[PDB]
Amino acid sequence: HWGYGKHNGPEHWHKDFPIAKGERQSPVDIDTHTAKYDPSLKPLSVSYDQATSLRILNNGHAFNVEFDDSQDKAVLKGGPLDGTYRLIQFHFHWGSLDGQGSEHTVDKKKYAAELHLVHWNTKYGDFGKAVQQPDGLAVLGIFLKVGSAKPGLQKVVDVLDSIKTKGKSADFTNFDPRGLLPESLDYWTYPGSLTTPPLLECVTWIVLKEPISVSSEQVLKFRKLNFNGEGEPEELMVDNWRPAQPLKNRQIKASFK
């Protein structure tokens, strides 16, 4: 039922998922002047050398590039995290226009898109158990602006016409997510939630300050995907982002300055 239209978009989700109005919802606006530099925060450790991508899936909301997370191969640690979080998938949220699409904002600035690399805390054994814990997930968020192409994104873009509609998947092996990272790992972090239903409050968010640049042609191909299934009226997959939610009783911390 839920999605991103007038009839079933973010402003409706609370009726099936009442935590939509909870105390630690995501995304948020990152007010860079009031984020506190925390000299106790560690460099993030992103260890993606042995990542094993398997498949890419249009799930009707976004596309997910999925990884084999049955061993400790692509892991996030350090930063604000205790313990070791394993990469399970990444996906993006993007707009119908270059001036919107990100979920997080920075001093109210929206970016053209935002990439989420989703990781789960290995102390909980698997992703389905982790989402039921307040420290179950760590999502690394990276902003996309439109400018020069991102060469490490092109393999993803070029497979999208094979997964145009909801429910389609394609083999997607040997994809290296290190090609999607900016140069700096400086970040903001705060406790929050999944940004789509079920909206569970299980995520430590780590949002990088440096955006990556993608070309206008790369994001135009994201906007050619469809939310609908094959044989249904075409609804372009655009504007699949949740707007910023109330910060409430939270403190965003900065790893830098």
Ligand SMILES: Cc1cc(=O)[nH]c(SCC(=O)c2ccc(S(N)(=O)=O)cc2)n1
């Ligand atoms: C309990 C449960 C199980 C599941 O398979 N998916 C979900 S929601 C989908 C999901 O895995 C997910 C959703 C949103 C985000 S986000 N947009 O916060 O990074 C990350 C992962 N919830």
Ligand SMILES: [Zn+2]
């Ligand atoms: Zn997301």
